[PDB]
Amino acid sequence: TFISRFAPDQPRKGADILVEALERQGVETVFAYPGGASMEIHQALTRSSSIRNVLPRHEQGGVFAAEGYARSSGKPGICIATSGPGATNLVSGLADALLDSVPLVAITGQVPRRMIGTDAFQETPIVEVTRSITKHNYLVMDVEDIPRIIEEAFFLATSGRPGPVLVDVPKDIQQQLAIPNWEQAMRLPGYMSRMPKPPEDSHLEQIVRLISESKKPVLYVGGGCLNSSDELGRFVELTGIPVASTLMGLGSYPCDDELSLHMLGMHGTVYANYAVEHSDLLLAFGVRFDDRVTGKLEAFASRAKIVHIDIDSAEIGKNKTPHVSVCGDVKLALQGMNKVLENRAEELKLDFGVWRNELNVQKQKFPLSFKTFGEAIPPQYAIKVLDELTDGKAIISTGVGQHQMWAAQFYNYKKPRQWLSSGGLGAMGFGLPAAIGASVANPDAIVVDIDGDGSFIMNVQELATIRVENLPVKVLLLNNQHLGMVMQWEDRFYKANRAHTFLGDPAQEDEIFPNMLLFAAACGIPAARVTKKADLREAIQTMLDTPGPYLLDVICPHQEHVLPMIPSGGTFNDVITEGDGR
Amino acid sequence: TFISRFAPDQPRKGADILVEALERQGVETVFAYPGGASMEIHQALTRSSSIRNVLPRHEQGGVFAAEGYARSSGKPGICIATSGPGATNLVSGLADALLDSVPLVAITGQVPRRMIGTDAFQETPIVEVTRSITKHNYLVMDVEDIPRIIEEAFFLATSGRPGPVLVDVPKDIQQQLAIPNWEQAMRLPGYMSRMPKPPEDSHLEQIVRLISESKKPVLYVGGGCLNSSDELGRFVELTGIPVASTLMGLGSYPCDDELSLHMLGMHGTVYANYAVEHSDLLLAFGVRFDDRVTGKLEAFASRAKIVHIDIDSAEIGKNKTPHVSVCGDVKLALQGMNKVLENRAEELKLDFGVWRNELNVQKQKFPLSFKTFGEAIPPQYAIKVLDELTDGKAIISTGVGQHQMWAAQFYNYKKPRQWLSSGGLGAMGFGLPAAIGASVANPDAIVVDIDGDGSFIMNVQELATIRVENLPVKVLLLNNQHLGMVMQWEDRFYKANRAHTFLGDPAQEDEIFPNMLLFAAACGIPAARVTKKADLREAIQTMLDTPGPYLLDVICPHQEHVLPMIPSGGTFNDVITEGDGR
Amino acid sequence: TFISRFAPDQPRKGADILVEALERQGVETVFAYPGGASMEIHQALTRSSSIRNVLPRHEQGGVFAAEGYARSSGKPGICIATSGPGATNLVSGLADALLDSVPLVAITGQVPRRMIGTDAFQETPIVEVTRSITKHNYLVMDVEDIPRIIEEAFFLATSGRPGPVLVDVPKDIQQQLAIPNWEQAMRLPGYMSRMPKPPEDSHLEQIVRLISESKKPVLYVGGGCLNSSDELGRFVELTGIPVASTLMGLGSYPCDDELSLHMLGMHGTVYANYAVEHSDLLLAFGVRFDDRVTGKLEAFASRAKIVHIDIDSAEIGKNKTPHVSVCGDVKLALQGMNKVLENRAEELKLDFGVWRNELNVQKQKFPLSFKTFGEAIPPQYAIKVLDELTDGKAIISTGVGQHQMWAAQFYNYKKPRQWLSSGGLGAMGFGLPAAIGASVANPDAIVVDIDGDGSFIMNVQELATIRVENLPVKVLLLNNQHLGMVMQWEDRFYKANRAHTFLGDPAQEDEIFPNMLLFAAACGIPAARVTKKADLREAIQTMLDTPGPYLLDVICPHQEHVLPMIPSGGTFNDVITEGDGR
Ligand SMILES: Cc1cc2nc3c(=O)[nH]c(=O)nc-3n(C[C@H](O)[C@H](O)[C@H](O)COP(=O)(O)OP(=O)(O)OC[C@H]3O[C@@H](n4cnc5c(N)ncnc54)[C@H](O)[C@@H]3O)c2cc1C
Ligand SMILES: Cc1cc2nc3c(=O)[nH]c(=O)nc-3n(C[C@H](O)[C@H](O)[C@H](O)COP(=O)(O)OP(=O)(O)OC[C@H]3O[C@@H](n4cnc5c(N)ncnc54)[C@H](O)[C@@H]3O)c2cc1C
Ligand SMILES: Cc1cc2nc3c(=O)[nH]c(=O)nc-3n(C[C@H](O)[C@H](O)[C@H](O)COP(=O)(O)OP(=O)(O)OC[C@H]3O[C@@H](n4cnc5c(N)ncnc54)[C@H](O)[C@@H]3O)c2cc1C
Ligand SMILES: COC(=O)c1ccccc1S(=O)(=O)NC(=O)N(C)c1nc(C)nc(OC)n1
Ligand SMILES: COC(=O)c1ccccc1S(=O)(=O)NC(=O)N(C)c1nc(C)nc(OC)n1
Ligand SMILES: COC(=O)c1ccccc1S(=O)(=O)NC(=O)N(C)c1nc(C)nc(OC)n1
Ligand SMILES: [Mg+2]
Ligand SMILES: [Mg+2]
Ligand SMILES: [Mg+2]
């Protein structure tokens, strides 16, 4: 099948073996930034005709690009860096991918083996450093192990609970000649013998039974359902159970559906939290009962039976004790439960209409709401216009903060892998680079990065990348001259005492600083600004119509606040529904 | 002495205690970027009237700024970040400070103690991660320990071999009220009982004896002499021994002195290496026999007695076996040896004139040299003009690569802490932020950042910082559209096969991309470009005269090569003296 | 309440503070072996009038004695050793206590703080070494922390899932004078915030419901019920559900009860395993689904709903996925379920008589059985006679191997903490020392150690301890000249090819070697031997009647085999029911 590039008996550099290992893995895109310790790999990289490299302007831009790629496709993301500083500049991405469970494979060059542990030029114990922030990592000590390690890395990165895997390759190993054996068996006896088995009809039977015995059932869908979109959908029409989602599960189930309670959590809708607060059957599929969702654990879903299906055993019972658990692939769990539901149809007569109304009233008395002031642009409205003009078919990349929450609240995702946002670690400067990856992974798609002026600038250097790689990335910048989310907290908990949260120039407090348009100009990317709500729709429309890259600097009043809001460690009775820094 | 801000019996937040601990340490400048987990500290920070905060646009800019501060002053550098992503974004700086032995103290907020180890929002085992890349680190588990930990951190960071120390402070510890005890004794029994003692007249006597018995003595000065400038100077006029320096020791001894052999190493002058290759007495003061200096160890200084004085015992004998070692402060070693030299003056009759000539001939037959082509600007010449126009009294910040080597070769440092450059780890994107720190630490000084287009862009966001903080930073950008140092290696070892080393836009190969001037414009920083050598002096002169920030985009032909050059792991007989990518 | 021994304002050595901390913890017995690094503690120990020390002849005898103490009482066990070799000689005990979840506190002296990490005399990184084999450990760095660390150690050792905690105390800290503060609050925010909450009536309600809905229910009781003897008993008479127990749960429920299916597992009764193989409701209380119990996981209890109640969340779902879990104290779970069972009595009408008969038939067709040959002594019979003569009220200590399995099969424990045997790690040489601890903890009890000639000799030096401490320990030695359990495996899987399993003297293959009676003689402990089954009852009777220590060397044919037997990783269909090495 795989047509190689070297004679079956022809020796090649380890570098060449590693690249072929990537080709053999199906990799066709990598984000690598050249450095002395990784030159060989880059050279070997040019000899490949199937793998293309998107050279970023910073290694952090490399990983985030790799995450965007992974998140927007389902394929693993591949980033490559050199030794020392190259490697250290990946840390945030690795930690981010681990926290959000994103399939990733990072390759870093390392000093020659004999030089390791001598404070050699450009060296750092990257395996030591990254051990706690990666799913697993390796330090190649012989060119013979390359094929096996690369296969184990991709296997581990994409199986079970997806996650990052780093492979450290010494320079001398890169230059060493050898005849690769593409048959070696992986050495993963423990991991593999612990891989969940398909769900038993036994357990699934108990769930379908718990459902029929409930009056107030609620689905609590998370990131773990991103691949069971159909299965999940079907399950919903067979049970008619309201669907509340996490920030990571957005898209698994359409937001524009009447059964959709939308997002729950600290900034979830009042009705989604209500539904969970008063439920009697919590179907937690693909979630990890995070604190930004439970608040006070003892008070979370305290009135119902909890069914928790997760691919990671270490997650079942970590914070909430289920009354029914199922360790395994939620996609298969749904597939099985749908069967049972289709057969015992009539004998079940599932009807939760009364529950849905008790809910649809809350959805009515407390819908997501924003306020418009004069001709100022409401960020929510901006996002809403973007939704409308793109017909909600756009891939949305995001920074971290208020804009991130509004980009989640006011856009309606039809499918999963349309929403790329750093949730667990919440890393700033994620949007622009992530957009880059999503675009390369989806050439014919609309890719809009909804950023904040704070986040946007951290990895603004990637604008050079977007231009040179000629990627149609659109940047919907919601500029509010501040570090919004931190600012909102100062207002509500520190009597609005600003502590280094203003990003503009104090010398000219009324001038928009910096002038993001000029950053775009420097990288030859057409840009425009809008201040009046009136001419916002056309602005967004222009951005979309103009071929290629485009930056739309949208100005918003900073006193805006994300709502509703359940303070950290709170209860549904603590939800804040109104007020702003105004 | 220290007038507090809280009643001796008045409880305050841990946050307030930590800041007072910083004031009590003499800290008057910190570089902190606000985040949820560190809000309290930032609030406590606003209540301080002695400590000023320089808010960067990226946490990596925060640390590098802290390094620049430290390096340009001698004081420790203080950077503060939030939990999770804030913390991870410091890794490169910490690793950099450890490798170059820079006094640093980093404070990171952390999630509440009870939340630690639960995959909480924005958390990462920063102490675990940073253990191998820091001199030492802590995880505060009680507000009572703050005073002690902060004192131990500064003590450890600045004593012995300077280095980075990270202190992890949980959010709940920050908000906890207490009465600080500023008397607690440090718990450093092992460390302190191992702190080198002043040099014995015994050993020093043997060195002064070895000197008188030598014919070809050579001083190999390194970063460890940055505080013994005078002592070193005196020692030289009492012995008349030629001074070769490392990239980290530049400035310890004036480059514009006839006894100065300048820098040795991979890119050292042909005469400095010659002097060491043929010496019979190597006086290695404050060096760590790095590979970019020794190349092939068995061949390095293989013809002479090696005297190695280092403050770190783990360094003496790590690569080269001394024939005489002295574990202790080189400043004191010099002080003592100078005494012995002044007394036994006449009876010694130290004269190495013949050696100096055998050398001064090499210095003549092989001086540092560059070539001029038409009206193109030679980067070396540019730097030389900068030297002239600033009278070599400027503080020079640097990126990593060719420009870094030329900025080292063609500038004459009169004193130490005038040359701030990442040597051990060699981190890119170090120059702009480092310049920021050096400037804040030296308000009335000329601070020029000699950058490369590759490095400059990684942390270009710090231009916003420079403007808002109104710092007179000058950026002498040597734009060559490539990743120079990597490019030079492709030329000499890969038949000039470019592998992702071009930073411009392939669509318009002749247009300078990006347009660095517009980046400057976005942040309101006056900028200009020069392409003709003719009008270079005026350009540089303008940059200097124009009050405040200034960016001078200097265009250079990329086929330039740094010379001479001893390939990695080579010998003096392998030194390359000519050729370029032309 | 606690009357101290030092003035509230009187400084004392750390050593004195540590002992008072032990007195304040209720400790009245410790097993310590003096060494240079721990002298101070031993001195401080003599000044205590409440704590008595049982000096062993080996530190391994110290820990095992501490385990026996703990296991036979419920109180934590306290052993103390010196630095270096003293400490290392505890490793096996610590690992043993961790594996079996035994409350233990070990204190080791350490070299002075300043000497740590210098290869000092008698030092070893005991905290580093023991980190993975202890529940938690400490390294005291200041005399001020002694009170707090000791309190945290006992708290952690006895709470949640009991386990070993080691405290490393530097010599200088021991001699340092201070005024102890017995009020300091423990620093266990994470641990404490994660301590299970009492069971909710919700879950308990579901269990009681699952019971009424089952036809073939089976209780799978383990070590975790050792403190819920009554609760468990009551639960059984309210549901009439058969009770199968693990090797660690023996005694929780009386073996001499008709509802008792006895022990299950690799060497469990054929009927206990049958009951589990064909059950429809597995009530796993206080067990950890060990492999010596499940064999092939997919085949274990594969026909029923699994309810698993455990105090350790990390155990629920580790090997078998429950259909109902309850993280919390099984004692409280039982208490709650018994209430529900008493009220809904009539409406439940729980009757499992048919199940019990389907079982009582197996119990009849396949009872535990042994064979008698001529006048040779059957080890099983010996143990049975011991049971009879002691009326099953004796505390039984054990070695590891065949004798251990027979001591478990042929003795009927009425209550928990009557059976002290190393199960998880299965350490040899555990019996004699454990007996010592059980005896000191139960002065007026019959304490018989059923040992094997292999195990008995490893810590035979403790016979000196038994005599000097004048403890009424009886040693029922089942001498078979071999390493039985290993021997049985050679017979069934290696064609009886003996590989170093014979403990006698090959020169006189028929002579019993060694002569255990003479070991007893050396320590002045009356002893006797029996070879004829006929005069066995009187022999055992004598041992019991003779005041004080006594060793009865019982000779048995070695070709005996433990039965039944399900080979490692097997199924109930693989159970071996007959055959011996004969
Ligand atoms: C400023 C800010 C505010 C936030 N506010 C909110 C908020 O209000 N609400 C909110 O929801 N979040 C919020 N978050 C995000 C939050 O931090 C968590 O990232 C999010 O709650 C995690 O949701 P999750 O557990 O569903 O997804 P993940 O964290 O992706 O976890 C998925 C889980 O599914 C399991 N799983 C994976 N694949 C499969 C499979 N095939 N079959 C079965 N199981 C599988 C995993 O192993 C894991 O346990 C916020 C973050 C930031 C930065
Ligand atoms: C592109 C690139 C090229 C390079 N090329 C060269 C080159 O050609 N030549 C070159 O020199 N370097 C070069 N380097 C830098 C190089 O990596 C090393 O950083 C440098 O050689 C280290 O020199 P050092 O040992 O003198 O200083 P340091 O690394 O700072 O080490 C100082 C030493 O002094 C000891 N010491 C500290 N304080 C005291 C005191 N008070 N008393 C006594 N002892 C003390 C320390 O503990 C330590 O062992 C290059 C780096 C890069 C990025
Ligand atoms: C030669 C040899 C042969 C063996 N053969 C067998 C055999 O055939 N059958 C057999 O059973 N064993 C056998 N073993 C013993 C075996 O290795 C395991 O030690 C035993 O199966 C463990 O049983 P357990 O899980 O019930 O107890 P433990 O290992 O003590 O585990 C108890 C569990 O209960 C939990 N728990 C503790 N306290 C509480 C509380 N208050 N409330 C709720 N939960 C709590 C714990 O945290 C833990 O998960 C053998 C060992 C040896 C040396
Ligand atoms: C990146 O550094 C190393 O990996 C390295 C580290 C210590 C000893 C020998 C080497 S090496 O000989 O094997 N390679 C090397 O020095 N390289 C690959 C390198 N590349 C570039 C682009 N510049 C410089 O040095 C100034 N070195
Ligand atoms: C940064 O996060 C934490 O440190 C934290 C992590 C897990 C549980 C509880 C907390 S916390 O309650 O103590 N604090 C918190 O959630 N903060 C301080 C916070 N700050 C900001 C600016 N935004 C958000 O959340 C969206 N949280
Ligand atoms: C056990 O050793 C140590 O703990 C120790 C180790 C290194 C340096 C200094 C000491 S020490 O000075 O503080 N103590 C010491 O040497 N002791 C307490 C000791 N005790 C005995 C019974 N014999 C010997 O030494 C032969 N030393
Ligand atoms: Mg903003
Ligand atoms: Mg360049
Ligand atoms: Mg035996």
- Integer-rounded Cα radius of gyration of chain C: 25
Q: How many angstroms separate the most distant Cα atoms in chain A? A: 75
Residue A57, min C-alpha distance to chain B (Å): 6
Sequential DSSP letters for C443-466: TTS-EEEEEEHHHHHHTTTHHHHH
**Bridge partners, residue A529, by sequence:** A553
Cα gap B341→B236, rounded to integer Å? 11
CA dist., res. B389 & res. B204, Å (int): 42
What value, to the nearest 5°, has the Cα angle with vertex A310 and ends A309 and A311? 135
| Ligand 5 pocket: which of B116, B121, B126, B173 to mutate (most atoms within 8 A of CB) | B121
For chains A and B, CB pairs below 8 A equal 244
Q: Which residues contact A40 (CB under 8 A, 6 or more apart)?
A: A13, A14, A15, A109, A171, A174, A175
DSSP state of C236: H
Distance CA B35, CA B83 (A): 7
SS3 for B449?
strand
Q: Which burial class, exposed, middle or buried, applies to B65 when counting CB atoms under 10 A from its CB (0-12, 13-18, 19+)?
A: buried
Exposure letters C34-47 (e unless 16+ CB within 10 A, then b): bbebbbbbbebbee
> Of the residues C195, C210, C239, which one is the last residue of a structural domain?
C195
Residues C317 and C233 in one domain: yes
Residue A440: its H or E element: helix A431-441
CB contact under 8 A, A316 and C317: yes
Domain of residue B300, CATH code: 3.40.50.1220
Q: Give the residue, by CA position, lying nearest to ligand 5 atom 21.
A: B36
Residues A417, A557 within the same domain: yes
Compute the distance between CA of residue C318 and CA of residue C86 in angstroms, rounded to an integer: 36
d(CA C309, CA C228): 13
* CA–CA separation, C2 and C24 (whole Å): 7
Q: Which residues of A touch B91 (CB under 8 A)?
A: 88-89, 91-92, 129
Residues C348 and C444 in one domain: no
Report the SS3 class of residue A97: helix
Which tokens sit at A386? 């973007």
Give A416 Cα–ligand 7 centroid separation in angstroms.
27
Ligand 3 centroid to residue C98 C-alpha, Å: 12
Same domain? A345 vs A494: no
Distance from CA of B578 to the nearest CA of C (A): 51
Resolution (angstroms) stands at 2.9
Tell whether C353 and C214 lie within a shared domain.
yes
Which ligand is closest in space to the CA of residue C458? 9
- R_g of chain A computed on alpha carbons: 25
State which of A164, A195, A226 marks the end of a domain.
A195
Nearest to C453 by CA among C549, C507, C396, C517: C517
Residue of A nearest to C206 (CA): A323
Same domain, B380 and B418: yes
Q: Is A319 in the pocket of ligand 5 (CB under 6 A)?
A: no
CA–CA dist A502, C421 (Å, integer): 67
C505 Cα–ligand 9 center, Å: 14
A166 neighbors A138 (Cβ within 8 angstroms): yes
Kindly state whether residues A360 and A389 are assigned to the same domain. no
**Terminal Cα-to-Cα distance of chain B (whole angstroms):** 65
CB C577 within 8 A of CB C567: no
Q: From CA B72, how far away is CA B70, in angstroms rounded?
A: 6
- Strands (DSSP E) along C211-337, which ranges? 217-221, 243-245, 260-263, 281-285, 305-310, 324-327
**Helices B379-390 and B402-409 sit at what angle, rounded to 10 degrees?**
40
Distance to chain A for C280, nearest Cα, Å = 11
Beta strands in B121-216 (DSSP E): 136-139, 164-170, 177-178
Query: Which tokens go with B416?
Result: 């130490």
CB C340 within 8 A of CB C204: yes
| Same domain for C426 and C313 | no
Interface probe, candidates A213, A279, A321, A324, chain C, greatest C C-beta count within 10 A: A321
Question: Which residues are within 8 A (CB) of B81 and not within 5 positions of it... i.e. 6 or more apart?
Answer: B32, B33, B35, B38, B59, B62, B87, B89, B90, B106, B107, B108, B109
Neighbours of B79 (CB within 10 A): 32
As given in the structure block, the two tokens for residue A65 are: 């690009």
Across the A/C interface, how many CB contacts are shorter than 8 Å?
41
- What angle in degrees, to the nearest 10, is found between the helix axes of A353-365 and A270-277? 140
Residue B115 C-alpha, separation from nearest chain C C-alpha, in angstroms: 7
Residue with tokens 């030194």: B575
Q: Is B264 annotated as a binding residue?
A: yes
Alpha carbon separation from C16 to A127, C3, C44, C174, C183 (Å, rounded)? 45, 15, 5, 8, 17
Between the CA of residue B470 and those of A194, A498, B55, B465, C168, what are the distances in Å?
A: 59, 20, 12, 8, 55
Residue C456, number of CB atoms within 10 A of its CB? 26
| Candidates A485, A487, A516, A565; catalytic one | A485
Interchain CB distance below 8 Å, A317 and C318: no
Q: Which of A210, A140, A212 is nearest to A178 (CA)?
A: A140
Strands (E) in C152-297, as ranges, are 164-170, 177-178, 217-221, 243-245, 260-263, 281-285
- Helical axes B330-343 vs B201-212, angle rounded to 10°: 60
Name the residue among A406, A390, A397, A468 with its Cα closest to residue A428.
A397
Binding-site residues of C for chlorimuron-ethyl sit at 171, 291-292, 489, 568
Using the beta-carbon criterion (under 8 Å), do C141 and B117 form an inter-chain contact? no
Q: Is C567 in the pocket of ligand 3 (CB under 6 A)?
A: no
Structure solved using which method? X-ray
Instruction: Name the phi and psi angles at C117, rounded to 5.
Output: 80, 30
Q: Are residues A344 and A403 in the same domain?
A: no
The distance of Cα C532 from the centroid of its chain, to the nearest Å, equals 32
Residue B376 belongs to domain with CATH number: 3.40.50.970
Residue of C nearest to B143 (CA): C187
A159 is in an annotated binding site: no
Distance C568 CA to ligand 3 centre (A): 16
The dihedral over CA atoms of C400, C404, C405, C406, expressed in degrees to the nearest 10, equals 150
The C-alpha angle B239, B240, B241, rounded to 5 degrees, equals: 90
Q: Please pick, among A43, A122, A206, A461, the residue that the annotation labels catalytic.
A: A122
Q: First CA to last CA across chain A, in angstroms?
A: 65
Query: Who's near A512: CB < 8 A, 6+ residues apart?
Result: A479, A481, A504, A529, A553, A555
Other CB atoms closer than 10 Å to residue B298's CB: what's the count?
A: 9
Residue of C390, C486, C469 lying closest to C433 (CA atoms): C469
The token duo for A408 is 């989640």
| Overall domain count for chain A | 3
**What is the distance between the alpha carbons of residues C385 and C534, in angstroms, rounded to a whole number?**
12
Q: Are A298 and A181 within one domain?
A: no
Choose one of B195, B226, B253: the last residue of a domain: B195
The residue assigned the tokens 């020390």 is C53
A206 is in an annotated binding site: no
Q: Which domain holds residue B174?
A: 1-195
Sign, CA torsion C210/C211/C213/C216: positive
> Residue with structure tokens 């340009």?
B72
Is residue B124 located within the same domain as residue B216?
no
Backbone angles phi, psi at A358, to 5 degrees: -50, -30
In contact, B103 and B441? CB cutoff 8 Å = no
φ, ψ for residue B392 (rounded to 5)?
Answer: 55, 30
Yes or no: say if C397 and C493 are a contact pair by the CB < 8 Å rule.
Answer: no
Q: In this structure, are residues A88 and A126 in contact, taking their beta carbons and an 8 Å threshold? A: yes
How far apart, in whole angstroms, are the C-alpha atoms of residue C350 and residue C215?
10
Residues 6+ apart with CB under 8 A from A189: none
- Stretch (H or E) spanning B262: strand B260-263
Is C171 tagged catalytic? yes
Q: Which stretches of C185-263 are DSSP H helices?
A: 189-193, 201-212, 229-239
C335-354 as b/e: b if 16+ CB within 10 A: bbbbebbeeeeeebebebee
Helix (H) or strand (E) holding B305: strand B305-310
3-state secondary structure A7-55: CCCCCEEHHHHHHHHHHHCCCCEEEECCCHHHHHHHHHHHCCCCCEECC
Question: Is residue B527 in contact with ligand 2, taking CB distance under 6 Å?
Answer: no
Ligand 1 atom closest to A566 (CA): 8
Note whether A330 and A203 are same-domain residues: yes
Strand runs labelled E in B457-546: 473-479, 527-530
Whole-number Å distance, alpha carbon C226 to ligand 3 midpoint, is 11
Ligand closest in space to the Cα of B568? 4
